[PDB]
Amino acid sequence: GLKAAQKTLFPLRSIDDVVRLFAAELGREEPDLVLLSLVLGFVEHFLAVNRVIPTNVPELTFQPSPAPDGLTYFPVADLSIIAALYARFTAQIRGAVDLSLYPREGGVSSRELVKKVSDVIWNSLSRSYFKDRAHIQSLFSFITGTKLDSSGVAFAVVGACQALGLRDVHLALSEDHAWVVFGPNGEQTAEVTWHGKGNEDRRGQTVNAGVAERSWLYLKGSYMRCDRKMEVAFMVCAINPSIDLHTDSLELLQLQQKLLWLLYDLGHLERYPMALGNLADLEELEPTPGRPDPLTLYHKGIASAKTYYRDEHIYPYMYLAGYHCRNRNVREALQAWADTATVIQDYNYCREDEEIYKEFFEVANDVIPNLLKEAASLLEASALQDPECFAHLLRFYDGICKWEEGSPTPVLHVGWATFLVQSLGRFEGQVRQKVRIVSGTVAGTARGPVLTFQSEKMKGMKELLVATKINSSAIKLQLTA
Ligand SMILES: CNC(=O)O[C@H]1CCC[C@@H]1[C@]1(C2CCN(CC3CN(c4ccc(S(=O)(=O)c5ccncc5)cc4)C3)CC2)CN(C)Cc2ccccc21
């Protein structure tokens, strides 16, 4: 329930008031996920979902404040409103799950109980709604509009488990999926939501099969296993400032930025590489004085991935590659994309890994080709004369070819092939020839750029890629084989 220490910080008439609430709750032994998710959901609703202030609705009020170029109206999170919704949730879950009927062997939650709570959330949801709809992540959505996005279901199951007093059930995240972790050592996995559009219902099942499959979706087992603090972080990263496709709520941007700096300072993003990248993106738009540069943050994310996740994550490098791409840094962007490909090389492409495929596809056949086309125009009155770029480009295609190896479905098709030739061509033979494609001569040590191919496809083409004249026939045929 809501304790006196929580209720005294209400009402929340500003961003700074909401941050105070989070700061307090993060200090608590067990931060209340339900309360924090409801508050965020409440403010997001009026700052992005429906910005029109209600004319008839009493008891609901707005707080005027000076804006940095007139006035801004913030939704006042009243204790009456937030507690009413909090009460509705706890009522709904407690009045559906009979704890007496389940034996809590030394506090450890049984698989049967986990599945029950998972079913309560699942069966409460609307029969038909657009699953990729924005602002349907928070518990405010589950209560007010009974709609939740894919990862939102998993967050709710964890929030609901917490309400029931089950302090061992936690959120488990990958880079494109969410599930639950529980057990006496927290080694029992349970699917509690769906993935993609029409890929069957694996709910209630274990994650073991996807981990063994070497699929990017279950990150070969080196996925995030949240604590209550990392769950709060997820919640903050889940803030959606999008009003529409081209505009954003400044208050929700300013709110997500402040909450992430708070989380950072208590060291709660040290195991969340994608959060460091999100904070970096926000620091790029409106940098807060005193705080580190976006590049410091982009690399803190990469550092986190290498330290706590065996350097098996893709987005930390994508976040950096995007920043350099935005800043037209070409070599640095192509370096970062080549690093991304080195990670995906020891993964196998499975049907459910479609999101990361679409990402590599856009960079290989749209983003990189545009950067090189732009680079070519700027030459006529530099990165196309740098041999390191051409090495990075080839290392990028090396990782993708290596990824395809051992995969049940092919990655590279004739569509990838055309853009390889085009991109190779953007570099003059003289520049291409400077890159030495060496397999190595002596293993270890005793007491122009150099590149080694890991993939068979790229190895078989080493001589073709470096030739003065490009044989489109052979290069296309070898990449697609
Ligand atoms: C923010 N951290 C986080 O955990 O946000 C959670 C919170 C709620 C769900 C959400 C998420 C994430 C969202 C972030 N993307 C990562 C972002 C970073 N990208 C990114 C992709 C490509 C490039 S590029 O360089 O190739 C490029 C640049 C320019 N033009 C073309 C291409 C640059 C940047 C996407 C990851 C998923 C949502 N998701 C649907 C389910 C989910 C599931 C588990 C964990 C998190 C999440």
Measured in Å, residue 78 CA sits from the centre of ligand 1 at 33
Within 10 angstroms of residue 470's Cβ, the number of other Cβ atoms is 17
Contact 238, 173 (CB under 8 A): no
Q: Could you give the CA distance from residue 462 to residue 457 in angstroms, rounded to a whole number?
A: 9
Residue 264's nearest CA partner among 248, 242, 252, 282 is: 282
Q: Could you give the CA distance from residue 410 to residue 439 in angstroms, rounded to a whole number?
A: 26
CA angle 123, 128, 129 (to 5 degrees): 105
Residue 289 φ then ψ, to 5° = -60, 135
Measured in Å, residue 225 CA sits from the centre of ligand 1 at 18
Residue range(s) defining the domain that contains residue 109 = 1-481
Q: Could you give the CA distance from residue 223 to residue 465 in angstroms, rounded to a whole number?
A: 37
Mutate to test the pocket of ligand 1, among 304, 315, 337 (most ligand atoms within 8 A of CB): 315
C-alpha pair distances (Å), 437 with each of 168, 316, 322, 428: 51, 28, 28, 17
Helices (H), 220-330: 228-237, 250-265, 273-285, 294-308, 315-326
Q: Could you give the CA distance from residue 241 to residue 251 in angstroms, rounded to a whole number?
A: 8
Residue 266's nearest CA partner among 26, 428, 448, 59 is: 26
Give the three-state DSSP class for 73. strand
Length of the chain: 481
Token code pair at residue 340: 């991304």
Q: Could you give the CA distance from residue 203 to residue 103 in angstroms, rounded to a whole number?
A: 22
Q: Could you give the CA distance from residue 473 to residue 343 in angstroms, rounded to a whole number?
A: 30
| DSSP summary character for residue 1 | -
C-alpha pair distances (Å), 481 with each of 64, 175, 249, 456, 461: 64, 30, 48, 11, 12
> Across the strands, what pairs with 28?
none
The atom of ligand 1 lying closest to the CA of 360 is 26
- Which one-letter amino acid corresponds to residue 158? V
Token code pair at residue 75: 């939704």
Measured in Å, residue 315 CA sits from the centre of ligand 1 at 7
C-alpha pair distances (Å), 480 with each of 31, 378, 400, 407, 421: 52, 32, 12, 14, 13
Residue 104 φ then ψ, to 5° = -85, 80
C-alpha pair distances (Å), 313 with each of 216, 217, 307, 308, 309: 9, 10, 11, 10, 7
Give the technique used to solve this structure: X-ray
**Those residues with Cβ within 8 angstroms of residue 157's Cβ, 6 or more apart along the chain or in another chain:** 117, 118, 121, 169, 180, 192, 193
**Those residues with Cβ within 8 angstroms of residue 397's Cβ, 6 or more apart along the chain or in another chain:** 341, 364, 420, 458, 479
The atom of ligand 1 lying closest to the CA of 321 is 25
Residue 11: cis peptide before it, omega within 30 degrees of 0? yes
Mutate to test the pocket of ligand 1, among 176, 195, 396 (most ligand atoms within 8 A of CB): 176
CA angle 104, 109, 114 (to 5 degrees): 125
Residue 164 φ then ψ, to 5° = -75, -5
CA angle 198, 175, 109 (to 5 degrees): 85
Residue 463 Cα to chain centre, angstroms: 39
Count of domains forming the chain: 1
Token code pair at residue 92: 């709904």
Q: Could you give the CA distance from residue 121 to residue 93 in angstroms, rounded to a whole number?
A: 8
Token code pair at residue 270: 């040290």
Contact 217, 352 (CB under 8 A): yes
